[PDB]
Design an enzyme around this catalytic site. Sequence first.
Site, PDB file in Angstrom:
ATOM      1  N   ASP A  28      70.762  40.026  16.140  1.00  0.00           N
ATOM      2  CA  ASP A  28      69.322  40.139  15.890  1.00  0.00           C
ATOM      3  C   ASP A  28      68.719  38.784  15.502  1.00  0.00           C
ATOM      4  O   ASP A  28      68.095  38.623  14.452  1.00  0.00           O
ATOM      5  CB  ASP A  28      69.046  41.201  14.819  1.00  0.00           C
ATOM      6  CG  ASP A  28      67.571  41.287  14.431  1.00  0.00           C
ATOM      7  OD1 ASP A  28      66.706  40.956  15.274  1.00  0.00           O
ATOM      8  OD2 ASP A  28      67.283  41.660  13.271  1.00  0.00           O
ATOM      9  N   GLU A  54      71.738  39.194  21.599  1.00  0.00           N
ATOM     10  CA  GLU A  54      70.439  38.959  20.960  1.00  0.00           C
ATOM     11  C   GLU A  54      70.449  37.663  20.144  1.00  0.00           C
ATOM     12  O   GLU A  54      70.079  37.631  18.970  1.00  0.00           O
ATOM     13  CB  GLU A  54      70.035  40.151  20.089  1.00  0.00           C
ATOM     14  CG  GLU A  54      68.577  40.150  19.664  1.00  0.00           C
ATOM     15  CD  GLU A  54      67.652  40.331  20.840  1.00  0.00           C
ATOM     16  OE1 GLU A  54      66.604  39.655  20.912  1.00  0.00           O
ATOM     17  OE2 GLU A  54      67.987  41.156  21.704  1.00  0.00           O
ATOM     18  N   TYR A 120      74.772  42.378  27.158  1.00  0.00           N
ATOM     19  CA  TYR A 120      73.645  42.865  26.379  1.00  0.00           C
ATOM     20  C   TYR A 120      72.800  43.663  27.365  1.00  0.00           C
ATOM     21  O   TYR A 120      72.001  43.093  28.116  1.00  0.00           O
ATOM     22  CB  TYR A 120      72.875  41.715  25.742  1.00  0.00           C
ATOM     23  CG  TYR A 120      71.687  42.156  24.936  1.00  0.00           C
ATOM     24  CD1 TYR A 120      71.695  43.370  24.261  1.00  0.00           C
ATOM     25  CD2 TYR A 120      70.548  41.375  24.870  1.00  0.00           C
ATOM     26  CE1 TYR A 120      70.609  43.786  23.525  1.00  0.00           C
ATOM     27  CE2 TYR A 120      69.448  41.783  24.142  1.00  0.00           C
ATOM     28  CZ  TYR A 120      69.486  42.990  23.468  1.00  0.00           C
ATOM     29  OH  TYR A 120      68.401  43.404  22.733  1.00  0.00           O
ATOM     30  N   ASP A 159      76.700  45.229  23.357  1.00  0.00           N
ATOM     31  CA  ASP A 159      75.625  46.187  23.104  1.00  0.00           C
ATOM     32  C   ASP A 159      75.253  46.840  24.429  1.00  0.00           C
ATOM     33  O   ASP A 159      74.501  46.273  25.222  1.00  0.00           O
ATOM     34  CB  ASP A 159      74.431  45.472  22.479  1.00  0.00           C
ATOM     35  CG  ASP A 159      73.298  46.409  22.124  1.00  0.00           C
ATOM     36  OD1 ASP A 159      73.358  47.610  22.467  1.00  0.00           O
ATOM     37  OD2 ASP A 159      72.326  45.924  21.502  1.00  0.00           O
ATOM     38  N   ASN A 161      73.626  49.699  24.664  1.00  0.00           N
ATOM     39  CA  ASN A 161      72.312  50.329  24.497  1.00  0.00           C
ATOM     40  C   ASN A 161      72.289  51.775  24.989  1.00  0.00           C
ATOM     41  O   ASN A 161      71.326  52.224  25.613  1.00  0.00           O
ATOM     42  CB  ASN A 161      71.223  49.503  25.185  1.00  0.00           C
ATOM     43  CG  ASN A 161      70.457  48.634  24.207  1.00  0.00           C
ATOM     44  OD1 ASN A 161      70.085  49.089  23.120  1.00  0.00           O
ATOM     45  ND2 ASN A 161      70.226  47.377  24.580  1.00  0.00           N
ATOM     46  N   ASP A 232      77.364  49.882  20.404  1.00  0.00           N
ATOM     47  CA  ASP A 232      78.224  48.738  20.687  1.00  0.00           C
ATOM     48  C   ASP A 232      79.653  49.222  20.908  1.00  0.00           C
ATOM     49  O   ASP A 232      80.160  50.031  20.126  1.00  0.00           O
ATOM     50  CB  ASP A 232      78.157  47.729  19.536  1.00  0.00           C
ATOM     51  CG  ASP A 232      76.731  47.298  19.229  1.00  0.00           C
ATOM     52  OD1 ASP A 232      76.059  47.975  18.418  1.00  0.00           O
ATOM     53  OD2 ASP A 232      76.274  46.289  19.813  1.00  0.00           O
ATOM     54  N   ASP A 257      70.410  44.391  12.405  1.00  0.00           N
ATOM     55  CA  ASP A 257      70.351  45.849  12.393  1.00  0.00           C
ATOM     56  C   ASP A 257      71.548  46.475  13.098  1.00  0.00           C
ATOM     57  O   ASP A 257      71.679  47.702  13.093  1.00  0.00           O
ATOM     58  CB  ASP A 257      69.039  46.386  13.000  1.00  0.00           C
ATOM     59  CG  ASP A 257      68.584  45.630  14.243  1.00  0.00           C
ATOM     60  OD1 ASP A 257      69.398  44.928  14.880  1.00  0.00           O
ATOM     61  OD2 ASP A 257      67.393  45.772  14.596  1.00  0.00           O
ATOM     62  N   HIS A 258      72.421  45.656  13.680  1.00  0.00           N
ATOM     63  CA  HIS A 258      73.719  46.067  14.188  1.00  0.00           C
ATOM     64  C   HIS A 258      74.808  45.543  13.258  1.00  0.00           C
ATOM     65  O   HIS A 258      74.628  44.526  12.586  1.00  0.00           O
ATOM     66  CB  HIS A 258      73.976  45.523  15.600  1.00  0.00           C
ATOM     67  CG  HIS A 258      73.080  46.092  16.658  1.00  0.00           C
ATOM     68  ND1 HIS A 258      73.563  46.822  17.723  1.00  0.00           N
ATOM     69  CD2 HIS A 258      71.739  46.019  16.831  1.00  0.00           C
ATOM     70  CE1 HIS A 258      72.557  47.181  18.503  1.00  0.00           C
ATOM     71  NE2 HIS A 258      71.439  46.706  17.984  1.00  0.00           N
TER      72      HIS A 258
END
EC number: 3.1.11.2
Length: 267
Positions: A28, A54, A120, A159, A161, A232, A257-258
């Site tokens: 992040d 990210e 990602y 990630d 998603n 993830d 936030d991960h």
Amino acid sequence: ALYEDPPDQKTSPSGKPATLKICSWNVDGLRAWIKKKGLDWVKEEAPDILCLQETKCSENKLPAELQELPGLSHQYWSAPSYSGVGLLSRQAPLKVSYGIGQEGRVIVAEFDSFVLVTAYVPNAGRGLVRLEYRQRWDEAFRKFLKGLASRKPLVLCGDLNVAHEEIDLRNPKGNKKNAGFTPQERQGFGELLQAVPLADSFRHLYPNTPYAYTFWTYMMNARSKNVGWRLDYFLLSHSLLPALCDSKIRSKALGSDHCPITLYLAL
DNA sequence: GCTGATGCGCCGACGGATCC
DNA sequence: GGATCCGTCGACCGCATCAGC
């Protein structure tokens, strides 16, 4: 319900000891993450390979701390020409390439006995405005992964998603129209496992463990309540499953936030 | 150079309806 | 009439640009 990851299993089920530690982390914003002591946690975790998503940071702007990493000195970055991913390795890979054949989302690194892909995956977006692009991307990614020239087994991490099944997020019911849990994204994940083929390392080991998440929205103190999603992954070729020692969710490492995830392989 | 406003990408809480 | 289902709405952060001093 809160979650606590089981202890590190550093030996394969047959009994061979882990020899490779891979960590993957959506940070992040790499510069913010570093200021929030993200690199301190990486040093304590001491992985052989670190994969970042990210990064939000072009290479000329990488903090100097990142060239103070003597155990992770082979570094590869890819930004869109926002987003951005990174791959750091103790040893030099044999080959590195970017993309899936400049979005800055995928890094492919060939090592001695395996190929590592970090990704990602594009988010479907608020109100699902980007869902059809995500579905088209999913199919191109699958084709790219299977079309990989090497006969070496594959480690895909990062990630992705998507919370694959209901057990992979706290609120499956209220989220089946939200990004990360549409039937279209879930189906794409199932197709990736079937097409390539690949196994969900964490789920192969803990097939019935609920409340294990890797993302919590910053809003509404969701992380305090462990209202989260499992976005993830480490996905493994079937032939790597005997080498699989454990797949970890590092719930307590802050900075994004991960949270980080960690793979132990016995190669 | 530096700050702060603004824009952009990145769902859990809550209120209301239906069901037995 | 508690449980469930469904649709609505406000909002955390990091990083960009832009405006001003």
